[PDB]
Amino acid sequence: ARIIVVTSGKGGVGKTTSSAAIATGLAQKGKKTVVIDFAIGLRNLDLIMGCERRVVYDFVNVIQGDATLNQALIKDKRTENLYILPASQTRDKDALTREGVAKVLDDLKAMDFEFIVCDSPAGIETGALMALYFADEAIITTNPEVSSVRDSDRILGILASKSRRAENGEEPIKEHLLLTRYNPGRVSRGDMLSMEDVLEILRIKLVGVIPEDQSVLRASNQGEPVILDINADAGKAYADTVERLLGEERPFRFIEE
Amino acid sequence: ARIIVVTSGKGGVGKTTSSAAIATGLAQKGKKTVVIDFAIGLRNLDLIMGCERRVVYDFVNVIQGDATLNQALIKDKRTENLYILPASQTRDKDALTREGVAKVLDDLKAMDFEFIVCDSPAGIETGALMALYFADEAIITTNPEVSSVRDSDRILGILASKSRRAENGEEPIKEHLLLTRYNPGRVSRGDMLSMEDVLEILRIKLVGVIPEDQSVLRASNQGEPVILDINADAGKAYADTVERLLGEERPFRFIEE
Numbered sequence: 404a405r406i407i408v409v410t411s412g413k414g415g416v417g418k419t420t421s422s423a424a425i426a427t428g429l430a431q432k433g434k435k436t437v438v439i440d441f442a443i444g445l446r447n448l449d450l451i452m453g454c455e456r457r458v459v460y461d462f463v464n465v466i467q468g469d470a471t472l473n474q475a476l477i478k479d480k481r482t483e484n485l486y487i488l489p490a491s492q493t494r495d496k497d498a499l500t501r502e503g504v505a506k507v508l509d510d511l512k513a514m515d516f517e518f519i520v521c522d523s524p525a526g527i528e529t530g531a532l533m534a535l536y537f538a539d540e541a542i543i544t545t546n547p548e549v550s551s552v553r554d555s556d557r558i559l560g561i562l563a564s565k566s567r568r569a570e571n572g573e574e575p576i577k578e579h580l581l582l583t584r585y586n587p588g589r590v591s592r593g594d595m596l597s598m599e600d601v602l603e604i605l606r607i608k609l610v611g612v613i614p615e616d617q618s619v620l621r622a623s624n625q626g627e628p629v630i631l632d633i634n635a636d637a638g639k640a641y642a643d644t645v646e647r648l649l650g651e652e653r654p655f656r657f658i659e660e
Numbered sequence: 661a662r663i664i665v666v667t668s669g670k671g672g673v674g675k676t677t678s679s680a681a682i683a684t685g686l687a688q689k690g691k692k693t694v695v696i697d698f699a700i701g702l703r704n705l706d707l708i709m710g711c712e713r714r715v716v717y718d719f720v721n722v723i724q725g726d727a728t729l730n731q732a733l734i735k736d737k738r739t740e741n742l743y744i745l746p747a748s749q750t751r752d753k754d755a756l757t758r759e760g761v762a763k764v765l766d767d768l769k770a771m772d773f774e775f776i777v778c779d780s781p782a783g784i785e786t787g788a789l790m791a792l793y794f795a796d797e798a799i800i801t802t803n804p805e806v807s808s809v810r811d812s813d814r815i816l817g818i819l820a821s822k823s824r825r826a827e828n829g830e831e832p833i834k835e836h837l838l839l840t841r842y843n844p845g846r847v848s849r850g851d852m853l854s855m856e857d858v859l860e861i862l863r864i865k866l867v868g869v870i871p872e873d874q875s876v877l878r879a880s881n882q883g884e885p886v887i888l889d890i891n892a893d894a895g896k897a898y899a900d901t902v903e904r905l906l907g908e909e910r911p912f913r914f915i916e917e
């Protein structure tokens with residue numbers, strides 16, 4: 404029911420990190436969840452969730468009738484009710500079609516997935532447009548830096564004009580701001596925008612703030628989404644985010660020096 | 661004569677940082693240089709070079725006959741023989757055409773530019789393909805992490821199959837590896853791939869290693885390409901890179917802790 408795109412425009416801000424962590428948190432809360440790699444050509448989700456060697460069929464194979472969801476969905480290694488739909492290594496802009504994508508989303512809804520997390524590619528070309536097109540909600544992943552922040556602002560424009568909902572005048576895509584790689588030291592020395600600074604500029608509700616954290620690269624190398632590291636500030640920050648996404652309120656930690 | 665694309669596939673590895681720095685180093689060595697923003701419509705090069713307020717016309721305006729190069733080219737603020745061709749804020753995948761782009765490149769060659777540095781968008785969709793299509797050389801911008809490194813490998817495949825040169829069997833695009841955000845501490849603790857590790861995997865000649873450096877965000881905020889900061893390891897690393905690009909050999913510093 405809740406299709407959430409993880410987007411940014413700006414490259415390398417942490418979309419996939421966030422997609423893996425958030426999808427895992429949701430599933431840990433009992434919500435049946437699939438996280439989908441929309442980053443066709445340059446797949447990465449399966450590496451981050453550490454299910455690489457179980458990749459048999461992909462998003463494109465399914466669209467193209469070469470495999471069913473049942474064949475393509477990978478059951479997560481660590482967390483119940485979590486599934487992964489990996490991206491094709493093929494490059495082919497049209498490979499993902501609106502019609503195909505739409506059908507996949509209908510089919511997953513039909514498997515009673517509560518949450519469908521869509522890991523977007525960078526940019527605002529067709530790759531990222533596809534990823535957000537059918538979104539109900541959007542997580543704008545933003546580093547507290549001018550460029551990330553500008554690109555995020557632009558992404559908002561696109562959310563409000565080139566999504567299905569914005570083209571058919573339905574309720575607009577719900578917008579969540581997720582600040583990532585927040586370095587409070589750097590912020591007090593005036594090189595990064597404060598949480599507040601960014602909020603003034605973007606003007607959407609903050610869903611999370613993920614501290615800059617050495618545990619994230621470690622999580623990646625292990626193929627273990629950081630949230631599974633219970634001692635990691637970044638992990639806790641993601642658990643908090645998942646709480647906010649589910650209606651609970653939580654104070655924002657790891658934002659002070 | 662030397663058209664060099666700065667590419668990566670992987671988002672946020674530092675293509676624009678590198679483009680600005682390298683383009684500036686070349687011009688500083690007396691080589692007439694233009695650096696072009698291919699990242700339409702998430703433009704960023706003009707921010708990094710700090711010429712934002714002088715943006716009048718862009719890459720698309722020129723293609724579309726709405727302006728000439730002379731009207732669109734921005735003369736750099738600090739460095740002689742350096743010019744900037746900013747990207748359009750418009751979003752339109754076709755906005756840049758092969759025919760248009762090709763013509764622009766011919767015209768710049770005609771203004772006797774020795775170096776044409778092309779700042780690529782992330783990904784391997786049409787944005788990045790356009791950026792590398794007419795390349796003579798390619799700077800593969802890579803963070804010493806598994807994903808960056810994988811995507812860089814993939815970029816190489818694309819360089820050797822979907823560039824003009826690879827489609828007409830001309831001399832292949834010359835491949836330069838540029839390791840960025842190299843954190844020697846992290847590397848010795850086994851979280852980042854050593855310079856050597858990456859070299860085994862990518863297998864192209866190293867042109868530079870840019871240390872992780874707080875000066876880079878400072879450079880960006882200032883709009884002063886980091887190479888102009890003479891006290892910055894990152895800047896020195898870029899000056900070294902420019903030396904290597906021009907045939908000189910230099911040992912790789914800031915790689916040890």
Ligand SMILES: Nc1ncnc2c1ncn2[C@@H]1O[C@H](COP(=O)(O)OP(=O)(O)OP(=O)(O)O)[C@@H](O)[C@H]1O
Pocket residue numbers: 411413414415416417418419420421442523524525583584585613614615616617619620623637669670671672782805807
């Ligand atoms: N909280 C954090 N602390 C430290 N490093 C982080 C954090 N979040 C992300 N990173 C780093 O940022 C880089 C990009 O992460 P990730 O691949 O998730 O970003 P992305 O936006 O999905 O990238 P792309 O644009 O290629 O899709 C990685 O090097 C990751 O380690």
Ligand SMILES: Nc1ncnc2c1ncn2[C@@H]1O[C@H](COP(=O)(O)OP(=O)(O)OP(=O)(O)O)[C@@H](O)[C@H]1O
Pocket residue numbers: 412413414415525546548550668670671672673674675676677678699780781782840841842870871872873874876877880894
């Ligand atoms: N040597 C470095 N030290 C510290 N930070 C760096 C370094 N190089 C790049 N960065 C940081 O990495 C992030 C991305 O930089 P940049 O925008 O130049 O990369 P990019 O590949 O052009 O991104 P995109 O994929 O959006 O085009 C920025 O936060 C920048 O400050």
Ligand SMILES: [Mg+2]
Pocket residue numbers: 418419420442447523524
């Ligand atoms: Mg990603």
Ligand SMILES: [Mg+2]
Pocket residue numbers: 675676699704780781
């Ligand atoms: Mg860039």
